[PDB]
Design a protein around this ligand. Structure first.
Ligand SMILES: CCCCCCCCCCCCCCCCCC(=O)OC[C@H](COP(=O)([O-])OCC(O)COP(=O)([O-])OC[C@@H](COC(=O)CCCCCCCCCCCCCCCCC)OC(=O)CCCCCCCCCCCCCCCCC)OC(=O)CCCCCCCCCCCCCCCCC
Ligand SMILES: CCCCCCCCCCCCCCCCCC(=O)OC[C@H](COP(=O)([O-])OCC(O)COP(=O)([O-])OC[C@@H](COC(=O)CCCCCCCCCCCCCCCCC)OC(=O)CCCCCCCCCCCCCCCCC)OC(=O)CCCCCCCCCCCCCCCCC
Ligand SMILES: CCCCCCCCCCCCCCCCCC(=O)OC[C@H](COP(=O)([O-])OCC(O)COP(=O)([O-])OC[C@@H](COC(=O)CCCCCCCCCCCCCCCCC)OC(=O)CCCCCCCCCCCCCCCCC)OC(=O)CCCCCCCCCCCCCCCCC
Ligand SMILES: CCCCCCCCCCCCCCCCC[C@@H](O)O[C@H](CO[C@H](O)CCCCCCCCCCCCCCC)COP(=O)(O)OCC[N+](C)(C)C
Ligand SMILES: CCCCCCCCCCCCCCCCC[C@@H](O)O[C@H](CO[C@H](O)CCCCCCCCCCCCCCC)COP(=O)(O)OCC[N+](C)(C)C
Ligand SMILES: CCCCCCCC/C=C\CCCCCCCC(=O)OC[C@H](COP(=O)(O)OCCN)OC(=O)CCCCCCC/C=C\CCCCCCCC
Ligand SMILES: CCCCCCCC/C=C\CCCCCCCC(=O)O[C@H](COC(=O)CCCCCCC/C=C/CCCCCCCC)COP(=O)(O)OCCN
Ligand SMILES: Nc1ncnc2c1ncn2[C@@H]1O[C@H](COP(=O)(O)OP(=O)(O)O)[C@@H](O)[C@H]1O
Lengths: 98, 55, 459, 320, 122, 49, 44, 347
């Protein structure tokens, strides 16, 4: 395949890795989720433009819509976590175990 | 020596002891998503290599 | 087979719609009536089994087992109603319901035409037994006993399920007639060796085979009296019946796959009989005796001769009657003195003479006095084993001696000597207890007159 | 139509019934003060429903026929023998206190249900909020253990957090020597044994914990012994109170819906009273438990659900 | 893993094709229907027991509705099940017929000419 | 006997009872008619009767 | 003579946060009765 | 939460699942998952407290990660074939990614860590929903793409699920975590038979949903969430504990109960495909689930634990709310084995 496609898939892998390996802040993980969506948008757009699937030009917009909903959902939960602990740290949410 | 000790030891007591050890190993997680998510990364890497390279 | 089955089911609502003070009377009367009707399955054609329908059939192997089940139910009701007097009406009805469901599952298991139905009913017997043990058991130890009884049994029976569905995939059927007529030899391969083991180990753990027997002292000692009666008289015989059925698809592999089980059963015969000599608990002694007897049955089934199969059938029936009688005898004294220790109450012959007679007769049939059917079965098995190898007589001979020893030891310890001075609450024997003993004993003695009925299909 | 989500959806609301004299009122005071007469008078003047103080058999008053049941099937505690032998090693004291807290919780649920369903106000004698004065008195007199206090606090922490406190808290103030005077002149041979330290402990708990605490979310009206026979004057004092202080002005229809779903369903109210904390005073063994439950179910109207006991004359059981 | 989903000319959500009407309907005393009615009766009794009503007496209209609903649904369940087994057998026979080179008829021997191995029991 | 509403009182809800019994009866007659139609259509398709 | 039923010491085996308590899970405490933890004094 | 809002959110959860189930386009299936998650997060926090907040946060993080992976698999599949129809995946790498995404959505081992925590953190009603309705969509998607999936990865995750469900359930005293580990093991059973017969997957799912609904409704009726709190129910509602005892034995898979039918059907189907070994392991391992079910039945129905004095007051009150389908669910959870050949109607 083309060099450009490889780079976008690498971006997805890096953002996925970033999401998986947490640090202290939740907001950083939320950002990683957004990054994954951004790379998915770019990849699907490149594939759609290249093959000239005309009707599929609308699916990246739908992708963005749902990405926004997910982002909004993530920020709500962060507001509630911060209100509980005064901090958005992952370590605070250890009340429930396996 | 046989009924009360060794026949007890080999079949039922060994089973109880092993399952008790494995339950303690499996269920004693600290509830930190950092640790759980880190394992998910390990699992994802393993599948796409020792399962995805094999077809 | 429907004529026997529907009335048994009927027993269920008959006891649920009975007045609070008539449950025992009603259940006992109609249980006895069902037993009488069942008595009619003993007429056997000869060349082949009676096939009532596609689903059920009766054999000469099967007929004795069914009559023993149906006869054991009213005896269990007589034995239960004493220690259950303080219980509420609903819980008494629940206990009787457990016993009825157990009888229903047992009758169906013995007569099912195919193995999958046999497996399902043979496994369904676990639930009422477990509930009886763990809910009505007197001691704290009953919970542990229930777990041991369940897990030992399932660890054997699940590989059997896998083996059975595999066998139906390769053969096309699990119907016992088709299984018999289309039998083909089992090659000597690792696959066939593990198929043999998966077909045999469930019935081995039901018997129980020596070394896989640890669940039985727990479960038989911690159970209420009726639970113990049905566990020793009938539930041990599921293993023997299933093995006798299943060993038709296992030839010629059995010729050498039987060696370790024969070694275990003979040496463990000696072992459990010796254990009975140093036992402080009286129920524990009767349980281990059952183990010793079932080891003999395992040997008989493994050597696969007509004389050994006849002896195994006779010994299964005789053991079922004798072991139930011994458990009931021990329970009467336990009811008196509220302890299972054998040296607590001594010299009981001075206080209870007719019960001492029942004790003597039960101890005499336990050591297989001629011409009782206990000795008929034991002698036939011993002869078949002698033909199998002349050196088995040494083990068989040793076992006969140790059995006489512990049987008469139990009799002498509980009935003879002088009475313990302190215990003064030993009341005269009730009519209920004497009638229970007689209803155990009279059938056994009657069976000697017509030995062929309990002999089986080979006869 | 039983009240539930469907009733709240189509129509039914609480705020359209609240009409300025809803005003949950509680009239507290030490032992043998005249708080009961004042409470009845306030209720009759303002037109509110009166609730006599919850006793050992309050729950019996609300179920079956309102007749009380035997003490072994209901309560299993004795107020008389708490006066006779308060230190008895059968745990009668804390058993009584815990049963009385449960009874007051049930009565608070009943009163809130009345108010939220009919709009009419209620008057209570004591509450789950003032119940602890007796607990502290018993504990300071060596009548109950530290563990009983901890268990009490657990049950209270998980039960009392669900309800709205009263609008008005009326405290009838009578000094302890007057209390002892009234006690001796009453005649009850058991109440005679009440020491002065016990009444002093009740009064100290009242005045140092209950009133300062309720004064933060409720408005408090204190009255001495003599100025408490004037029911007209107390009612005038209540009619000119500006209830702008507690959580009641922060209540709209949805919080009222949650509260009204909770105050009916008495089993949900009483849920946390029987938490598996094994104090010897309140733990009952399996055999006694079984015996007493079997005996309860043989009471003439208790074997089945209310409308299904034909022994009590119920009809059309087959068709219900 | 999905054997009958892709079969040709199959309507998406019928539950009962028209071809099913060429099959004999289950009798109304079919023991499987009687068992479904018994299931409905047990549901009625457990209903009475949970609400602390007399178990065999309390709601007879309710118990009748339980039994009737179970029998009603079970009738159609049995129709669909018998129809699906009829489809299986139809397809299997047609496939065996159209592929004779996979299901050959070989001449069978009498036991007098088959040499079987003998294994003595001793 | 009982103190307050006891919503099902001495008489049963005749609306609910009537609706339940009507539902059962309608289901049974629908089932009988369905089975008759099934038998007739099956006999017609295979030429039995 | 009566059947044995569990008592307080038997019942308390099932009262911990976990069966089979180890040295680490010994300091685990069972969750609150209602599922409500006390609020933290994390003063903003 | 306003009742109308709660109804709208439950309807949005169900409509997202139905969108996953009726769609032919991969984008619409992804949208169904997104809509389901969006409406599902508030239902977990309906009763607000820090534990419910933490549970909803862990749930959102897990499910959104799964969603991103699922979308990436769809896009790789499109890259290697201009296809949007959900049939059989064209690319092996896309299929691995898709399988792992759906396993994360289901909570299969080694992605099982979230299920016990989230289940413990929420109420019994939300737990009922999470453990019954939230399984339909990924299982339907897996049933559609079953031919494409690699058996080695699927069966590995299924065997891990059974083992880990048993071991983790052995250590619990909280009833919600017991139910969660039970669910993990059941999911392992459902997915082990998927590459062979999707009808057996559907049958297992139906019976599991029936038994789980019965158990959760019995736990709500006797408002208990710990073992010791459920030990009291005998002294107030003995019928409830007897019914729970029988339902527990059915879950264990013991014959002649219904719970045994799915296990029996799955083992048989596997033997047909020459797979004796996997099933022997699966049954012998389900013995662990049976053990901790039996322990709960010991503490709850077969013996009588000590009680409290305040229970006498509860003796005087009937349950305010009654569950309409609880009686039917118990009967279908226990007494349905004689109707086994009716599974042919599922294919
Ligand atoms: C062989 C003799 C033939 C006699 C002909 C008539 C026999 C009729 C008897 C019918 C069966 C007996 C019923 C057994 C239960 C006892 C009932 C009871 O409680 O008694 C109360 C009654 C009232 O007395 P009591 O004053 O109130 O106080 C009693 C006290 O409790 C204490 O009083 P007690 O101390 O006197 O104890 C009562 C008695 C009762 O206790 C018993 O043990 C009696 C049962 C014998 C042993 C049972 C197991 C051994 C296995 C043998 C199986 C054989 C069964 C054959 C078919 C029988 C059909 C029922 O105990 C004994 O006497 C000692 C028993 C030792 C017997 C050893 C014999 C070994 C085998 C002998 C031959 C067997 C085969 C026959 C044919 C052989 C070839 C020709 O006492 C009696 O009536 C005494 C019983 C008579 C003794 C019978 C012993 C031999 C009979 C064996 C079976 C019969 C075979 C018939 C075929 C024809 C030959
Ligand atoms: C097949 C597979 C096997 C079975 C599947 C697995 C079963 C699992 C089901 C769990 C369901 C969970 C549940 O509902 O409550 C749990 C519940 C436990 O809760 P609980 O303790 O009784 O008390 C909860 C209270 O509700 C506490 O809450 P509350 O106080 O707020 O009470 C409010 C209550 C009372 O409700 C009301 O107040 C009614 C007022 C009406 C408000 C009007 C709102 C309408 C406007 C919204 C429109 C949205 C349209 C969406 C547009 C999408 C566009 C794409 O409403 C509810 O409780 C929930 C209502 C449920 C709605 C069901 C309607 C079906 C929706 C279908 C959507 C599909 C559309 C087409 C899709 C096309 C594809 C795109 O479980 C049960 O009661 C028994 C289990 C029954 C399960 C079903 C039985 C098996 C199947 C037969
Ligand atoms: C395979 C062969 C055939 C098998 C058949 C299938 C199996 C049986 C059917 C299963 C379902 C049917 C019954 C379900 C509802 C029962 C619920 C209940 O509470 O019952 C109480 C109720 C009695 O209560 P009550 O009269 O109101 O007064 C009692 C007091 O109030 C005091 O009452 P209480 O409520 O205060 O007492 C509480 C008590 C309440 O405890 C119970 O009642 C247990 C009920 C659990 C239901 C089981 C789940 C569903 C069935 C699955 C069965 C599985 C079978 C496979 C193996 C597993 C073994 C369980 O709990 C306890 O005391 C704690 C004891 C704990 C011990 C552990 C045992 C628990 C599990 C045992 C299950 C055994 C199987 C069921 C046995 C029959 C039960 C009635 O039962 C009945 O009176 C009715 C029973 C049936 C009568 C109808 C007969 C039909 C009409 C007669 C005519 C005959 C027709 C033929 C015509 C012929 C031509 C003329
Ligand atoms: C406490 C009570 C428990 C219950 C008792 C269970 C008894 C199970 C024992 C099974 C009986 C024998 C099993 C198989 C028969 C022969 C075994 C083997 O040793 O024989 C030789 C096999 O050779 C070697 O021994 C290979 C097997 C050695 C590996 C097995 C490990 C044994 C160690 C003991 C472990 C204990 C097992 C029980 C666990 C509790 C025969 O030589 P060969 O002709 O070539 O093989 C015959 C098979 N062919 C025809 C397919 C080729
Ligand atoms: C524990 C027992 C399980 C209980 C299960 C719930 C039973 C009640 C549910 C209500 C019954 C109505 C459901 C169907 C009514 C009409 C809808 C019909 O058109 O659906 C058809 C399908 O019919 C249904 O699937 C049959 C439902 C019958 C379920 C019961 C079988 C249970 C197995 C054995 C247990 C015995 C149960 C006893 C009954 C109480 C559509 O066919 P199709 O769109 O092409 O297939 C979709 C799936 N595919 C493509 C993947 C194959
Ligand atoms: C690979 C995995 C294979 C899975 C095999 C599972 C075997 C099924 C048996 C499950 C036994 C579980 C026992 C356990 O976990 O704990 C031991 C238990 C812990 O006590 P709790 O009640 O949990 O807590 C009390 C204090 N609060 O301790 C005991 O005393 C156990 C008593 C009963 C044990 C019964 C064992 C009977 C086993 C019979 C032999 C066959 C077993 C199965 C394996 C067969 C061999 C291949
Ligand atoms: C309470 C304690 C009881 C313990 C009983 C345990 C022993 C039970 C007997 C063995 C159990 C597993 C047997 C498998 C079931 C039979 C199925 C079968 O026969 O299929 C075989 C398959 O055979 C196997 O795969 C079995 C391998 C063993 C896997 C599981 C090992 C478990 C432990 C084995 C030893 C223990 C057995 C004896 C222990 C007794 C109890 C002490 C051949 O089929 P194919 O694969 O098609 O081969 C030919 C075509 N190529
Ligand atoms: N929570 C409680 N704890 C202990 N005793 C109580 C409690 N509540 C009421 N009592 C008892 O009720 C008795 C009389 O009640 P009280 O209201 O003080 O007088 P009155 O009869 O005029 O209403 C008192 O002797 C008091 O001990």
């Amino acid at each position: 395949m083309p060099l450009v496609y490889m780079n976008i898939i690498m971006a997805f892998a890096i953002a996925l890795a970033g999401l998986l390996m947490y640090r202290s802040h939740l907001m950083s993980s939320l950002l990683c989720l957004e990054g994954m969506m951004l790379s998915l948008f770019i990849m699907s757009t490149l594939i759609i433009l290249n093959t000239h699937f005309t009707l599929a030009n609308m699916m990246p917009i739908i992708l963005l819509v749902f990405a926004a909903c997910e982002a909004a959902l993530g920020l709500s939960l962060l507001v509630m976590v911060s209100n509980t602990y005064g901090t958005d740290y992952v370590q605070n949410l250890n009340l429930l175990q396996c | 020596l046989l009924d009360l000790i060794w026949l007890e030891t080999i079949l039922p007591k060994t089973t109880s002891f092993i399952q008790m050890k494995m339950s303690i190993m499996v269920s004693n997680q600290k509830g930190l998503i950092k640790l759980y998510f880190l394992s998910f990364l390990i699992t994802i890497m393993i599948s796409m290599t020792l399962f995805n390279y094999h077809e | 087979m429907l004529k026997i089955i529907i009335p048994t089911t009927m027993l269920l609502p008959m006891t649920w719609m009975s007045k609070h003070n008539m449950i025992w009377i009603n259940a006992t009367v109609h249980s006895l009536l069902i037993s009488l009707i069942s008595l009619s399955l003993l007429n056997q054609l000869g060349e082949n089994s009676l096939n009532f329908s596609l689903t059920f059939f009766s054999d000469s192997l099967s007929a004795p087992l069914l009559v023993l089940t149906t006869w054991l139910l009213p005896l269990m009701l007589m034995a239960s109603q004493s220690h259950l007097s303080k219980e509420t009406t609903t819980r008494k009805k629940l206990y009787i319901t457990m016993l009825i469901l157990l009888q229903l599952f047992l009758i169906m298991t013995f007569t099912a035409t195919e193995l999958i139905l046999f497996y399902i009913l043979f496994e369904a017997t676990l639930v009422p037994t477990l509930i009886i043990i763990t809910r009505w058991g007197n001691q704290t130890e009953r919970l542990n006993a229930g777990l041991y009884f369940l897990f030992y049994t399932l660890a054997g029976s699940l590989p059997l399920l896998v083996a059975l569905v595999y066998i139906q995939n390769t053969t096309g059927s699990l119907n016992f007639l088709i299984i018999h007529y289309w039998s083909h030899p089992l090659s000597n391969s690792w696959s066939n060796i593990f198929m043999w083991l998966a077909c045999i180990m469930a019935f081995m753990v039901k018997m129980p085979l020596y070394g896989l027997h640890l669940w039985l002292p727990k479960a038989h000692v911690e159970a209420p009296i009726a639970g113990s009666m049905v566990l020793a008289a009938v539930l041990l015989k599921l293993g023997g019946y299933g093995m006798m059925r299943i060993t038709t698809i296992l030839n010629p592999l059995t010729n050498y796959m039987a060696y370790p089980f024969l070694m275990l059963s003979m040496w463990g015969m000696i072992m459990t009989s010796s254990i009975c000599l140093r036992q402080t608990d009286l129920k524990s002694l009767i349980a281990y005796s059952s183990v010793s007897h079932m080891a003999l049955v395992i040997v008989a089934i493994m050597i696969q001769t007509p004389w050994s199969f006849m002896g195994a059938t006779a010994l299964m029936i005789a053991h079922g009657l004798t072991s139930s009688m011994l458990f009931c005898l021990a329970n009467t004294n336990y009811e008196r003195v509220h302890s299972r220790t054998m040296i607590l109450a001594r010299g009981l012959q001075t206080l209870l003479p007719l019960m001492a007679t029942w004790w003597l007769v039960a101890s005499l049939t336990n050591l297989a006095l001629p011409p009782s059917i206990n000795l008929i079965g034991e002698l036939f098995i011993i002869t078949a084993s002698f033909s199998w190898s002349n050196i088995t007589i040494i083990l068989m001979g040793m076992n006969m001696m140790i059995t006489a020893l512990y049987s008469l030891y139990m009799l002498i310890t509980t009935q003879r000597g002088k009475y313990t001075h302190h215990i003064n609450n030993i009341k005269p024997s009730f009519t209920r207890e004497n009638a229970l003993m007689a209803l155990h004993i009279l059938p056994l003695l009657l069976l000697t007159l017509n030995p062929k009925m309990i002999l089986g299909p080979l006869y | 139509l039983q009240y539930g989500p469907l009733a709240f959806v189509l129509g039914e609301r609480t705020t359209r019934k609240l009409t300025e004299t809803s005003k949950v009122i509680t009239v507290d005071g030490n032992i043998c003060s005249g708080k009961g007469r004042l409470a009845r008078e306030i209720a009759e003047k303002l037109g509110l429903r009166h609730f006599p103080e919850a006793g050992i058999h309050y729950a019996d008053s609300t179920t079956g026929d309102g007749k009380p049941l035997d003490v072994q099937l209901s309560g299993n505690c004795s107020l008389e023998k708490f006066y006779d032998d308060p230190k008895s090693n059968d745990g009668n004291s804390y058993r009584l206190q815990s049963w009385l807290y449960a009874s007051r919780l049930l009565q608070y649920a009943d009163a809130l249900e009345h108010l939220l369903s009919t709009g009419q106000g209620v008057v209570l004698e004591r509450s789950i909020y003032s119940d602890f004065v007796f607990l502290e008195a018993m504990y300071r007199q060596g009548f109950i253990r530290k563990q009983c206090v901890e268990h009490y606090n657990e049950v209270k922490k998980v039960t009392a957090c669900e309800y709205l406190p009263p609008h008005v808290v009326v405290y009838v103030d009578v000094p302890v020597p007057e209390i002892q005077s009234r006690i001796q002149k009453k005649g009850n041979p058991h109440e005679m044994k009440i020491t002065a330290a016990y009444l002093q402990d009740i009064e100290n708990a009242y005045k140092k914990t209950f009133l300062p605490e309720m004064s933060e979310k409720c408005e408090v009206l204190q009255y001495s012994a003599r100025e408490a026979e004037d029911a007209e004057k107390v009612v005038e004092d209540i009619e000119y109170l500006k209830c702008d202080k507690g959580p009641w002005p922060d209540q709209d229809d949805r919080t009222f819906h949650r509260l009204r779903m909770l105050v009916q369903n008495k089993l949900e109210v009483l849920n946390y009273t029987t938490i598996p904390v094994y104090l010897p005073e309140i733990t009952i063994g399996a055999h006694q438990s079984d015996r007493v439950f079997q005996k309860f179910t043989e009471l003439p109207g208790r074997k089945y659900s209310p409308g299904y006991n034909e022994d009590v004359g119920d009809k059309w059981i087959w068709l219900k | 893993m999905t054997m009958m989903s892709g079969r040709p000319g199959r309507v998406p959500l019928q539950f009962l094709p028209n071809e099913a009407r060429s099959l004999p309907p289950p009798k109304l005393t079919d023991p499987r229907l009687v068992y479904m009615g018994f299931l409905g009766y047990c549901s009625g009794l457990i209903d009475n027991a949970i609400r602390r009503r007399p178990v065999v007496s309390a709601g007879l209209h309710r118990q009748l509705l339980y039994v009737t609903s179970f029998v009603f649904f079970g009738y159609y369940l049995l129709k669909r099940q018998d129809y699906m087994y009829a489809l299986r057998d139809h397809d299997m026979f047609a496939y065996v017929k159209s592929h004779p080179e996979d299901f050959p008829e070989k001449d069978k021997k009498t036991y007098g000419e088959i040499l079987e191995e003998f294994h003595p029991v001793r | 006997k009982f103190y307050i509403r006891e919503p099902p009182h001495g008489s049963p809800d005749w609306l609910k009872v009537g609706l339940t019994l009507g539902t059962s009866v309608f289901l049974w007659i629908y089932l009988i008619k369905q089975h008759k139609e099934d038998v007739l259509e099956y006999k017609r398709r295979n030429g039995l009767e | 003579a009566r059947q044995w039923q569990p008592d307080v010491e038997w019942a308390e085996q099932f009262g911990g946060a976990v069966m089979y308590p180890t040295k680490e899970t010994a300091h685990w405490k069972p969750p609150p009765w209602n599922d409500v933890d006390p609020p933290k004094d994390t003063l903003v | 939460m306003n009742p109308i809002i709660y109804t709208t959110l439950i309807m949005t959860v169900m409509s997202g699942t139905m969108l996953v189930m009726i769609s032919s386009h991969w984008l619409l299936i992804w949208i169904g998952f997104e809509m389901n998650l969006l409406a599902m997060i508030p239902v977990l926090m309906k009763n607000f407290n820090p534990r419910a907040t933490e549970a909803a946060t862990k749930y959102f993080l897990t499910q959104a990660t799964a969603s991103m992976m699922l979308m990436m698999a769809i896009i790789i599949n499109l890259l290697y074939s201009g296809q949007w129809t959900i049939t059989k995946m064209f690319n092996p790498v896309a299929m691995t990614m898709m399988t792992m995404a759906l396993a994360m959505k289901l909570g299969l081992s080694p992605f099982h860590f979230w299920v016990p925590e989230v289940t413990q953190g929420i109420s019994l009603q939300a737990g009922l929903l999470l453990l019954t309705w939230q399984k339909l969509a990924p299982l339907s998607v897996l049933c559609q793409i079953s031919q494409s999936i690699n058996p080695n990865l699927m069966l590995t995750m299924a065997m891990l699920s059974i083992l880990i469900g048993g071991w983790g359930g052995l250590n619990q005293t909280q009833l919600r975590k017991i139910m969660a580990y039970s669910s993990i093991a059941h999911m392992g059973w459902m997915t082990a038979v998927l590459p062979y017969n999707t009808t057996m997957t559907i049958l297992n799912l139906l019976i599991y949903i029936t038994m789980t609904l019965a158990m959760f409704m019995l736990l709500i009726h006797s408002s208990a969430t710990t073992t010791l709190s459920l030990s009291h129910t005998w002294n107030k509602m003995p019928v409830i504990t007897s019914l729970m005892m029988v339902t527990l034995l059915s879950m264990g898979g013991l014959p002649p109960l219904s719970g045994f039918m799915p296990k029996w059907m799955i083992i048989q189907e596997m033997t047909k495909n020459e797979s004796i070994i996997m099933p022997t392991l699966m049954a012998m391992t389900a013995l662990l689930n049976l053990y901790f079910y039996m322990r709960l039945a010991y503490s709850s129905s077969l013996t009588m634990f000590p009680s409290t004095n305040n229970m006498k007051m509860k003796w005087q009150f009937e349950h305010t709310k009654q569950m309409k389908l609880l009686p039917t669910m118990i009967v279908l959870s226990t007494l349905v084995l004689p109707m086994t050949p009716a599974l042919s109607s599922l294919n």
